[PDB]
Design an enzyme around this catalytic site. Structure first.
Site, mmCIF file in Angstrom:
data_model
loop_
_atom_site.group_PDB
_atom_site.id
_atom_site.type_symbol
_atom_site.label_atom_id
_atom_site.label_comp_id
_atom_site.label_asym_id
_atom_site.label_seq_id
_atom_site.Cartn_x
_atom_site.Cartn_y
_atom_site.Cartn_z
ATOM 1 N N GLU A 60 3.321 1.978 3.636
ATOM 2 C CA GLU A 60 2.181 2.752 4.196
ATOM 3 C C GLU A 60 1.054 1.804 4.643
ATOM 4 O O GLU A 60 0.349 2.154 5.612
ATOM 5 C CB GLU A 60 1.699 3.805 3.192
ATOM 6 C CG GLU A 60 1.042 3.251 1.934
ATOM 7 C CD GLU A 60 1.941 3.116 0.714
ATOM 8 O OE1 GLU A 60 3.124 2.756 0.884
ATOM 9 O OE2 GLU A 60 1.451 3.369 -0.411
ATOM 10 N N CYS A 101 7.430 2.548 -4.684
ATOM 11 C CA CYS A 101 7.058 1.912 -5.975
ATOM 12 C C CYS A 101 7.562 2.788 -7.131
ATOM 13 O O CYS A 101 8.770 2.713 -7.414
ATOM 14 C CB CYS A 101 5.558 1.646 -6.016
ATOM 15 S SG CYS A 101 5.095 0.407 -7.250
ATOM 16 N N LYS A 155 -19.022 6.297 8.754
ATOM 17 C CA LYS A 155 -19.508 4.935 9.099
ATOM 18 C C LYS A 155 -18.312 4.015 9.372
ATOM 19 O O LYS A 155 -18.362 3.260 10.363
ATOM 20 C CB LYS A 155 -20.372 4.373 7.966
ATOM 21 C CG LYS A 155 -21.739 5.027 7.795
ATOM 22 C CD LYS A 155 -22.617 4.339 6.771
ATOM 23 C CE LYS A 155 -22.101 4.455 5.352
ATOM 24 N NZ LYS A 155 -22.103 5.862 4.881
ATOM 25 N N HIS A 199 4.759 -1.178 -0.747
ATOM 26 C CA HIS A 199 3.985 -0.051 -0.160
ATOM 27 C C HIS A 199 3.997 -0.158 1.364
ATOM 28 O O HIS A 199 3.091 -0.754 1.944
ATOM 29 C CB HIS A 199 2.546 -0.065 -0.698
ATOM 30 C CG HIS A 199 2.432 0.321 -2.133
ATOM 31 N ND1 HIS A 199 2.160 1.616 -2.530
ATOM 32 C CD2 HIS A 199 2.544 -0.409 -3.264
ATOM 33 C CE1 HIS A 199 2.109 1.666 -3.846
ATOM 34 N NE2 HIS A 199 2.344 0.438 -4.319
#
Ligand code: GTF
Ligand code: GTF
Ligand code: GTF
EC number: 6.3.4.2
Lengths: 534, 534, 534
Positions: A508, A379, A18, A506
């Protein structure tokens, strides 16, 4: 400027994609110059994913405003440029919390508070808050139509559709059309029963998105069109794909964005998917291959590192390198030794909390530092890099974090309030979301980012102890990035190494397939250069 | 000793008398020597009725432990001797609050919190907590089967029935079997459709309670028996009645308690309903009639004074007097004058909050004091009695409560913390539930209760100001009852009057049809003696 | 222009008056100059009502084309001037017969014959056949929405609404909104659950007709409007009435016909309901009263004689006589004697089959003839009159019908094929629908009808035996009406009587409240004249 809503529901099974479908459609509409956004309504009772464990639900995504959200908002930011915030994700838990609190303030003025209209009103308010100011808003409803947990959401969006009207609302329903070997055909009966459940709660779908392990032929689409009373051009085939980057193209080729633009009376030019075509081409045609080890404590569910895995793939795209991501349990390094880190072209240690598996990550950072294997620490990945360099190069015996060993001699990582030196001398809260970081000149990261300042997103408590830092700096380690008035360490580098970088933030969460990321691009390039030398 | 559960649901319409039916059945089972209790599951989001307005939901009932509960717990305490507490009533709001708080404490250990099993588990825990330690527990499910709001409750009790087994659980379903003039018969079709909705959520009813404006004949009961697959003796007719006191007898005459005792394998003697027969006889055969005016600010919904209305009827039973309760708006006294208080044999001023209509209640207390009309004041009813006597007998001009006029010269009613005298000199939290009160010797209430100490239930903030009391006492007023270390005034009497009593506590909450209440019995007797003299 | 369809469905209970409401709406629309018809879809498996017992189903209504149909077509013809035919009524039985026959004729070409599309296609074909060529077609669906038996009808009309479109189709849904003494309000919850049932099978109602024992207030209609997503003017109150002739006015006053004409884009003048106002006025202002005894074998269910009871009422309107219809079991005349026929101003013996209770009817015919009590015999009512006269005036001992006593000496009634005389000498089946009858000069019926020829409707097998007729004519009985080449006896009179008429045909099937019927007008007039003489 009248805001349009596409309500995205799912039938038969939960795992229809979805989010991917909504994100992919948003990508097409954005490529037509439209201001689009997406929001996720989760039927869980959790106030937000902050409490939810990585090996149950997957990664906690962090928006720039510091919201802890569903990993689906990662899909959204990787498919459209519109920035997500707290407003783009809420749970049943949040809605009940809102209403219970409004009851205490006496905002209901002695009224009986009811699922209808009070819970449904609260849902509508948050959808409108997240939606208004946009040309098209895609609203993903979590769960499977017919289940109890999504009934308030479905009643809420049914009410919105009546108020706003069919000129500025569409119901897009994903369904499973499975193949039976016995009949040698895909089966529409599940779609029939699912759509009936939808009708019984007062929703008529406008668009059927047909999920199967193969193409849903025109014959079966025509059957679905009749029994759903929609045009055949509103019945879309979406077979299993090897790459989600193909989905915007597959949907555009079936005219879905044209159908939506006609229904909403939007005159906009044809979708330019040239950036997606480029991504697909890059992915299909890698020049060389690298094996990158991801060493962490949550590998039993890969979705725990969803955005990190995607960021590595984006690193591959920008270098025309195919990345074979090998998920390695850090506890296996503790017991079996560094024999399992052999044959790696580079090593990544991602984020985490708690001491379980951390010692393995420290050994892993040592292996990568000593054997000149390209390293990226995120991290916790930076914490174990600092502990390694403190223990084995600055000869600070049993150096650790106060998170893991509170009464350790050299707490090189600790909360700002806990900062002490080796003798116990002193000086004189979760950091979340976007923060400016200052890059040190002549650092690798200054070169890669090609800017003095960057903006990256945090999700951590424990900082580098500035009281024990200079001792580690003088032992050779270099501070590459800092932030704020407390001059907190954001990035470290080991310079006597081909490629060794570790950051507190982070990265990413800012990587996309279309724009990549400087750190991940640099890291995957180093992994290729290493592989060529062996 | 294995606890048995009777789950009481309702179909077709809301207003079937689920509570009365449960209470009436409990009365029969108690009359067979069984330890029984009742609990009400409310699907509203309100944490409890404390916030809910009297003219929307009806009266806030108060248990001895100080819980603010649904007025249905009034029915329960008026039909059985088993005392209600916080455990006998909870809302959807309470359940979501429980779960949201358990999530913060991290009791779910990073799990995704879901309607099933987490909300359903929370419901089951509270049912078991309220139920265990009893022979039979009746669990009333609020709402109409098929509505969204009750689906978690119905799933919860379905799970309980599977775990505990059909040997120690029964599903008792109330249904509407309405009369159509066109067909000249009662119609089972609504029961058919309702039972189908029940089957679809995995509940098979054991007992059908058929509500109609007339008897449901054996022919229609036989039809309902077949299509529900239950014995005909498990299909009960409960027509509209003129008195709820008849319902235990009507259910016993159809063998319902026998059916329940067989299903639960309970060997107990025949039900002795002689006390209910006596109540029915008393009610049917009043010797004389009185008109009693109830002057308050919530008369637009009579259920706001539910327990007070019942307490007056119980006063009638004990005196063999028929009480015609005339509900009079206190604001009508303010505008139209005391002409509307004429033709009353006695006057009652019940509890309330806020200044709107209070001045009318003060005038009403004056009228009753000066014209020797029997008076009973409850909570606010005592406040307006004290203000009247302070203003018009102790000549303390504009004496009031700090609730209504905070900066008044003579705050005869105020919070303990606000206590001041007329010059502004000083000395040196909602009171809820059962508290011992000491009765003054030679007082009317000491005679009526025939005990030095009583236990009655509170729901008030504002107390009698002890700094201004002695001045009112010396002007003739008498303190009849006190409580606690602060010696707070609980009961006042005007002695130069046939019958004038006002109390801080709510005596209506301790009145039953079988045992009556000393104050209400005395009050209704005085109303009769007054009527005879005119 | 394009034919418009109003689909009339019912929820909650069966006995809502779907036929009366459809017929009453048709009357308003006909008054606006529109060409309207009505048809009844019965979910029974009977091929047609011809087999169904009158004490189970009610009367078999007969159209002019000789179709045996539901009594609802009697309501239709009594409210609109559009003539009913076989095309205006069919059952599930007929539909399955249609399809099973088509299959054997190889019309499906070896296809699998399915509920969808073959059964639904057969339903649609028959609805179009009855409907096309009219401005508005009202299609009454028998049963209660949610039951198995009506699902194919509902799927068929759902398909028609999709094909034809919302411009030329409306869904009018009758529902029960019952009153509860406990709440002192009418309850919309049953309508909520019924409409959910409609939505689940793919039908959205346009109009809600709210049936109750009282007016459904504006507040309750407003709730229903919101839940159903229809305008407030599309929610109609239809309370229980004393007279069905008022229903056209009650619907018009709420603008129902305006709403229908707007949706169908029909520009037609305002309805003049003066013909209905006149009927209501006549009914409300009677001058005198009579008691008419109806002596038959089917009085167990009054609807057995639906059209006869209505014809007597219409006879009342014309003469300004209030008619008290006393239903008398003909078998009670056989046991208790002519005691029960005392205090009657007139006697009517209606139609029937089989010997049970016929001897009682012969005794009744004799009683009326001898004591000069006005008599009307219909079909069997004529047979028993002829038998009475043959036995007691012409002295033809044990004269009877071959239906009851096949080998009787004097078969005065018998099949044409069975016609014999007393000595057994002979000459050298069901009659259905409209047939011309020639009236005899100087007969009572020749005056009443005021024409030489009439058209009335038959449903009978057994005729007057012409071989024994001359003998009965010589004894004084007069033949008043004949038909066809066989010159069959249609009407007989006893001239030595104030008013004694008996007919083979069913005159009750051509009686209307607006136009009345000459025979019934004359019969009731004679009953009035007899009452005044007493
Ligand atoms: N609401 C409905 C709809 C249909 N059917 C009946 O469903 C039957 C056909 O069901 P199939 O053989 O499984 O085929 P398919 O529907 O095309 O489903 P698939 O795409 O999975 O193959 C008809 O006889 C019917 F009769 F049409 C039904 O009984 N009720
Ligand atoms: N699940 C069901 C159950 C029944 N019926 C059909 O329901 C029909 C009977 O419905 P009625 O005439 O209204 O009578 P009643 O059921 O006794 O209801 P009341 O007590 O309100 O009078 C049968 O033809 C049937 F066929 F039996 C049905 O179609 N589906
Ligand atoms: N699909 C639905 C619809 C409503 N409700 C819940 O239904 C409740 C109200 O139901 P009531 O007290 O019986 O009142 P009423 O609906 O007006 O019916 P009547 O006209 O017969 O009195 C809300 O809390 C609700 F929450 F709104 C529900 O749970 N699910």
């Amino acid at each position: 400027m009248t805001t349009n809503y596409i309500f995205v529901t799912g039938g038969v099974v939960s795992s229809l994609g979805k989010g991917i479908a909504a994100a992919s459609l948003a990508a097409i509409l954005e490529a037509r110059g439209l201001n689009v956004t997406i929001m996720k309504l989760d039927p869980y009772i959790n106030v937000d994913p902050g409490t939810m464990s990585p090996i149950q639900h997957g990664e906690v995504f962090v928006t720039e405003d510091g919201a802890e959200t569903d990993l689906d908002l990662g899909h959204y930011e990787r498919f459209i440029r519109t920035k997500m915030s707290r407003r783009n994700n809420f749970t049943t838990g949040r809605i009940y919390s809102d209403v219970l609190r409004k009851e205490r303030r006496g905002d209901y003025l002695g009224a009986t508070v009811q699922v209808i209209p009070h819970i449904t009103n609260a849902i509508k308010e948050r959808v409108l808050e997240g939606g208004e100011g946009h040309d098209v808003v895609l609203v993903e409803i979590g769960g499977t139509v017919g289940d109890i947990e999504s009934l308030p959401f479905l009643e809420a969006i049914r009410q919105m559709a009546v108020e706003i009207g069919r000129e500025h609302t569409l119901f897009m329903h994903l369904t499973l059309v499975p193949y039976m070997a016995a009949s040698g055909e895909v089966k529409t009966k599940p779609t029939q029963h699912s759509v009936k459940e939808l009708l019984s709660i007062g929703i008529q779908p406008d668009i059927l998105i047909c999920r199967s392990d193969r193409a849903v032929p025109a014959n079966e689409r025509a059957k679905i069109a009749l029994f759903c009373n929609v045009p055949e051009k509103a019945v879309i085939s979406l077979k299993d794909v090897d790459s989600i980057y193909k989905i915007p193209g597959l949907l555009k080729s079936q005219g879905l964005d044209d159908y939506i633009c006609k229904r909403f009376s939007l005159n906009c030019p044809e979708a330019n998917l040239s950036e997606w075509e480029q991504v697909i081409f890059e992915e299909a045609n890698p020049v060389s291959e690298v094996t990158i080890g991801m060493v962490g404590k949550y590998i039993e569910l890969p979705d725990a590192y969803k955005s990190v895995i995607e960021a590595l793939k984006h690193g591959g795209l920008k270098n025309r390198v195919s990345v074979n991501i090998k998920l390695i349990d850090s506890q296996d390094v503790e017991t079996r030794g560094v024999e399992i880190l052999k044959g790696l072209d580079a090593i990544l240690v991602p984020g985490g909390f708690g001491y379980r598996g951390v010692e393995g990550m420290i050994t892993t950072a040592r292996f990568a530092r000593e054997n000149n294997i390209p390293y990226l620490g995120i991290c916790l990945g930076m914490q174990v890099a600092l502990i390694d360099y403190a223990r084995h190069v600055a000869n600070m015996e049993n150096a650790n974090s106060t998170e893991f060993v509170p009464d350790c001699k050299y707490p090189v990582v600790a909360l700002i309030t806990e900062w002490r030196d080796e003798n116990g001398n002193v000086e004189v809260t979760m950091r979340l979301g976007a923060q400016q970081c200052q890059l040190v000149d002549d650092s690798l990261v200054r070169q890669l980012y090609n800017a003095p300042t960057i903006v990256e997103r945090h999700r951590h408590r424990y900082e580098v102890n500035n009281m024990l830092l200079k001792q580690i700096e003088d032992a050779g380690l270099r501070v590459a990035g800092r932030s704020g008035d407390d001059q907190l360490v954001e990035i470290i580098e080991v310079p006597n190494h081909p490629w060794f970088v570790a950051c507190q933030f982070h990265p990413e969460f800012t990587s996309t397939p279309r724009d990549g990321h400087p750190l991940f691009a640099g890291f995957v390039k180093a992994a290729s250069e290493f592989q060529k030398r062996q």
